Symmetry: D2
């Protein structure tokens, strides 16, 4: 007999596991337990802090919720109005010396006229082809070209997406982008060119809210804290090392065994196959593709430069920098970096030279957070990536050679993006149903490997819905129908449902 | 305080209300109660019997389930292998002296050659127009022409649908018809013409099971029997006369008041509006449209004629009979009509004449069930419709003039079909949310008026999901996304969920 | 027996008739003569002079020759280099205060940005519809929209063409416009909008030669002068009053009868019908439509204004002036108006006021020639049209209010344009073969009534080809195939053919 | 100075040369003469006779005139109604044991059903593609597929045209086929399949007339005979061996020199170039491509078999016979073969056996004329081609193994078809203008090398129009605009024109 027995064991306390846990706690029916190898819940939605006091998320993390239930849990966890800051969704594409507002194609008037001609011509071709199309695109590349035409494709989405995914766009499927027909809005694009006009897709009603304190990680610490502590096991004492699917027994690193009736595994499915010592599943999961994510963080002295301004996140298609995305993380909260009166020595100048003095000087400070992808098709030199990022900051005019860097951060995350390759679905549909037959709900960004439902709210709800499937026979909508959940307001499920109301009576 | 108080009240014990009751009974959380003005549950899925022992459903009722939950409750209600008879769909369309296999449009290959030309020419125009189409059809008619061409439109689709919906095809929308109306492949249809082949396997009901006893009504009586009797109130004692939405109080005919927290109403929503004395809702519901259904039953002496054979239901686009559909009801179960040893006198010959003898004679007997639609746009002479149907049977060679009729049946059902008019949705999106704000779940064939989810299983699940929404924050999928639930096997929700399994240990 | 007998009789000594006579005179086989009711040959290709010495053509006449034969005869008629002046086409469209380079539809780049958007959007619409179009436009208007979109239609093509054709675009066919109306390339038009470029090279008249003396009329006087005088009868003595198609006899106003074997008639065919006293033909010819042309000439004191420059002819779609076209006739030849030392009093100022004195002041002088159309759908007030035109010149900033007008000219030409109405071809194919079967070749601008072969070179060659058909069995290519003659260089026929070369040996 | 001087010299007395001469003789202005290496005029439109008395044209020659002038000359040559026989244009395609009426696609109901499916499916694809087509086909093969679809193309036009042109369909251009858009008549093809109907494109309207005597060759002997004898030089005495273009002299076999002012050459342009000792033109003309034609004639004993019947010419796509076309030449005139009373011995039976007697026996007789193509891409074994053709007649069931063959015929014509290769036009637009610059009108089937104007009427008119161009400045319509002359009634030019009517009075 196992050391512990529960009805539903949840492996992992990132967003997905915490989702499963929150729903179990609410339902308060079957017995349950959540574990994690980390003392701090949050997984890829965690936050680090440099010794100099600069916070960094695991790359740019911006919440766009598709679910009321998700909002309920964030509100419960961080209920105060000053637990959060609201910002407009401001983003730009760096192209040929210019900060081009997103979406890129509505703003090509910033480019030289010759290129505008090239762009419009390509989109005219794409429009005339769309008018007679009778097939769906089969690759990410085809989808891009049908949406944008060759000129606009070549300038942004093609080179940018290689830098993001670390695989060519021709090797990825496009179904994950949704059911929208791949066709250009030629009139919109041509109008802005003729008018010599720019327009970003943000404004007063296009916002996000970001945690006042502790970065994105502050959310999941708060959410996790609403759980009954005795049902949680976080840290080395909670690391799963073996999974016996036949006995429905899990073994922890310290030797503790847990019996379960249903298992919700939110660890990377390739690691689950290993933990299971399931040779067949190992072979299958190894056919999945992913990229690793390098997060580089740079702490800068001085008030926010005019050239940066209210920019939130930024895209880099060009090859004069290794990062695909930059975030002005200091714009997300005042508390993502030290206060102005905090004294810190200058480590280096942005051109790499030494400071004139090693004295600690006061702020104020601002902060840039960078992402660089890696795969077998796109290697990254760990010894030089920081320096190359900083040079990239100079090249893209985010920093001047004279800017004073006071803090640096670099961490590599092995499983960063699950890749929507052409082969993904053919693989997943062999893996996930075999786990299912063993009463294992493998769910999450790397639990079920689907990027289009791979954000915080999706992950959280994957865990919620998996529990709802286990207990109430609910349809796992987020898992099997990303277009469905992404295209509606999901308002039905709440942190307080009829079931808990009628019961209190 | 009212006479009785329940958390959830269900009005109506047709399939929809019984679905609500079954889910409420399974969950066993909130207190509940189901009422019906009729002593016998079943509603439009009930069965009458003539004094001579011939059973008739409310027209042809063939079960094609989209849900494992529905299957679970039917199996529970009628568990024995001999509770059911299994049949293949044998369906034909009467067209110019011939029986054309359903679907008509995929069986062109059986008509006169000169008519095959008209049909194939039409489909060729349609195919070429469809090749450059960039707009969706807006009316049922436009749909029909775009996917079939004029030839087939004029020959079958248009006259038949007027005949069954009792409004012209130009007055109906077309978002409802995914699993109802087969759109023909030009190549497939042409290929069958060339080869002289047929193709009768389109759609959901290629095999169905029919209750051995008591007609379709036997199911819902049996399902109702699994409910705790003290939580049911069927008959004059359970007739709802007043609804006070504001006090959340329902008043029954005998003056019994019932207080509720949540209301699931499965009566026709226009009658609900009347019962609420809500003159705003009355005006809105009167913008809906419906047809009435006349059901005519004819009991015939003799062994099943060769010309009839294993035919199940039959379509009649032409003008030589008033009915749009005939069901060989005696093919569905041997217990739908008297055994051969039953002695019955001949009431009339099929040509209308009086029988040679008034002596009771033995069988065997077979049985035809006919449907005739009526609306403000398609009036019916009530007084002559029985005779007109019988003559229609002679006209279409279903009966010989000398066939001996031993039993007749005619009953008018005022609300038969909720019509997918062009105005339907605009009206419903006013009505259903307004009731929703008053904590009223109006659901069902006429409860929510959507024919594309108007079958027994849909209705049942509308009830199940309304409860699942009220208690568990479930999405009402069947209600809001007909194409979604009709396009998948809905396996997740079971008559025994994890909730009950875990609780019982 | 009649007074005179010839093999071929030519009626009319405009370009078409002179064409006939030239070819007859070249061939020098069959006997022939040419008559005209006018003493001066030339027809609508003649030139008037005001008493103050200002020449005016019958509206803007610019030669654009498709035929070597025509070139041969003009060179023979006017062999000296200084018999001619060469000019580039400098043509513009007046639109919202600006001069837009011809053709309008290819110079969108010149309009305000907001008009530019409207125009391009319309062209984008048309481009997309044209990609799947499988029918030809039936009317001029349909053609316009289909090839240019609504924006350009409304802004220029529709008002301009009503103003010149004196019927709406919806009343005209569109098979005539190959070499008259440029079809805009979406890419080219958009590219020039983006770059801010112009495109003024479209068409056949990018370079023209104009006679140094006597206006366009100087050409036909000279051409007629190369004919043998005794074969001509120009003046009252050559006015045709009766045509007896049966006896093949023509009666002149002075009573002269001329018998013919073949008749080439170049007078308006409706005039021919009346002179034939052929009532059926009169009927048919009244089914044709034509507009009248008002020519207004304005002689102005001053050296050529800078705002005028090298402009040749100008289009006016707007309703701030009565005329559809202005020609800077003084730019065509220095001898179209008096020399600078010619003394002339000011008749009026352009603002309409009388001048201070009757003092004759010297030049130099420049000259504007205006055209205003009239039809039963577009009346012209003849008593005011001159003043309206002059006010028009002020409204369009052609003349300053203070400009000094020293000569004025107004003349109405009843048959100005043969309208390409919808009915035109149906009517002509009843008229011309009937005249053909009576050995009458009816040809020319109003002889055969086809504007697309309605220019001086066309007209001339219609006469030439008629003679060639009569004598040498040649195909009447210009008559029956406008697109064929207009799309090629017609170099084969010469004023000296092999026939004459060999005969002189 | 030369032995003879003329204004216009014509080399060749095939149809093209005779056309030139007929028009020269009609105009009767410039001096002229016509020469030919052959004593008998006619060229490839001549006729041979075997020693047994069977006539053979140079392959199937069927007149379809596009010109009145041609008809005038034929009718002048053979004016009696019994100089000609009239027949319906009856042709079939041999395909899988069947004689399929032409055109093939309207008669595929004779094929197996499974193949009808494949054909119709292919043509449906073609129809759908044609609806969105925005390009012209570039090759003959592309044109075939767009016209017929894949399945129909593979059965007839693709393998048949390889057998005709002796080059792949992918190596030929398709402009020569005319201006008709390459698109299926899907309804016409489908309608005949549905009706099970066959219908060839002949009837009372669709006829040809064939010479009663002397075969096609008789026409040209008769036309030549209307020429004044002393202006002709036919035989060894008229064989051109040298052309000196710079000196405008031709030298004949017997050493006679002829001076000309204009030269109409109708010999093959590659021999013209050789004769000109113009190495540049030699090199250019060698880049043209042509196939050689083998003609095989088989005289058969017996009355016409029922299986042959009224057939005229037959196409053979399949590879069980070497010939691409067969003609039932005995059906064209009863004088193409001996009378019934003529006695001939059997040479062999169709299976190759010896007859059971060498005695002469009487007729009647019938006759088959076959065509086999040869090129460098498709060799022909001259020594076995007769026997292979005869074996082909048995394989195609045209002859039974027992049929008695009483005459055989085989002749190879080196220049047989001028090939419309992709390269033809690029080559010809270099050859013809250089010859033109030297006053050489190279015209005819191999004179100007264009098959689409390569028939007897076309050829004749190339000579006629050449002369007309030389003398009267006419446009050479047939040379330059094949679509134009093939698409209209060319009725203007007559054998008696006004010129001769007027001069004779
Ligand atoms: O051969 C046929 C018979 C019926 N229908 C369509 O199918 C729909 C549903 O008819 P059915 O008998 O399936 O359903 P019911 O009326 O019983 O609910 C009708 O409205 C018809 O338009 C069709 O397209 N082809």
């Amino acid at each position: 007999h196992p050391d512990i027995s529960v009805d539903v064991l949840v492996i992992g306390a990132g967003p997905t596991g915490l989702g499963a846990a929150k729903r179990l706690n609410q339902i308060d029916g079957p017995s349950w337990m959540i574990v994690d190898s980390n003392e701090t819940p949050g997984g890829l939605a965690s936050t680090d802090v440099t010794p100099e006091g600069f916070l960094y998320d695991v790359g740019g993390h911006v919440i766009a919720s598709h679910y009321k239930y998700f909002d309920d849990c964030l509100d419960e966890a961080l209920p105060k109005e000053d637990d959060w800051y609201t910002h407009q969704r401001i983003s730009y594409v760096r192209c040929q010396g210019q900060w081009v507002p997103y979406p890129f194609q509505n703003n090509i008037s910033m480019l030289p006229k010759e290129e505008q001609v090239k762009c419009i011509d390509g989109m005219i071709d794409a429009a005339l082809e769309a008018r007679v199309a009778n097939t769906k695109p089969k690759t990410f590349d085809e989808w891009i070209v049908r949406m944008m035409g060759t000129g606009i494709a070549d300038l942004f989405m093609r080179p940018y997406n290689f830098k993001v995914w670390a695989v060519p766009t021709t090797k990825m499927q496009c179904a994950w982008l949704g059911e929208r027909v791949a066709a250009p809005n030629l009139k919109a694009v041509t109008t802005n060119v003729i008018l010599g006009k720019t327009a970003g897709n943000w404004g007063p009603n296009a916002t996000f809210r970001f945690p006042a304190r502790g970065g994105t990680g502050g959310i999941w610490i708060a959410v996790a804290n609403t759980l009954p502590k005795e049902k949680t096991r976080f840290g080395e004492k909670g690391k799963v090392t073996k999974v016996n699917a036949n006995n429905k027994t899990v073994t922890l690193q310290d030797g503790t065994t847990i019996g379960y009736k249903k298992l919700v595994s939110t660890m990377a499915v390739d690691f689950l196959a290993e933990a299971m010592n399931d040779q067949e599943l190992v072979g299958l999961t190894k056919q999945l593709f992913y990229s690793s994510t390098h997060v580089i963080g740079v702490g800068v002295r001085g008030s926010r430069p005019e050239r940066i301004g209210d920019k939130c996140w930024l895209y880099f298609p060009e090859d004069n920098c290794p990062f695909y995305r930059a975030t002005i993380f200091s714009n997300y909260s005042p508390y993502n970096q030290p206060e102005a009166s905090a004294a810190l020595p200058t480590m280096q100048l942005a051109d790499g030279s030494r400071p004139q003095s090693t004295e600690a000087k006061e702020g104020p400070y601002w902060s840039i957070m960078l992402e660089v992808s890696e795969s077998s098709m796109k290697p990254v030199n760990q010894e030089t990536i920081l320096a190359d990022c900083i040079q990239g900051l100079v090249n893209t005019e985010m920093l001047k050679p004279t800017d004073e860097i006071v803090s640096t951060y670099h961490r590599r995350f092995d499983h960063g993006y699950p890749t929507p390759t052409l082969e993904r679905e053919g693989t997943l549909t062999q893996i996930l149903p075999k786990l299912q037959d063993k009463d294992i709900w493998s769910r999450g960004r790397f639990g079920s490997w689907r990027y289009e439902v791979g954000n915080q709210d999706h992950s959280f709800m994957l865990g919620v819905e998996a529990v709802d499937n286990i207990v109430n026979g609910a349809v796992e909508l987020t898992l099997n129908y990303p277009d469905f959940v992404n295209g509606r307001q999901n308002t039905e499920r709440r942190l307080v449902d009829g079931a808990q109301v009628f019961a209190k009576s």
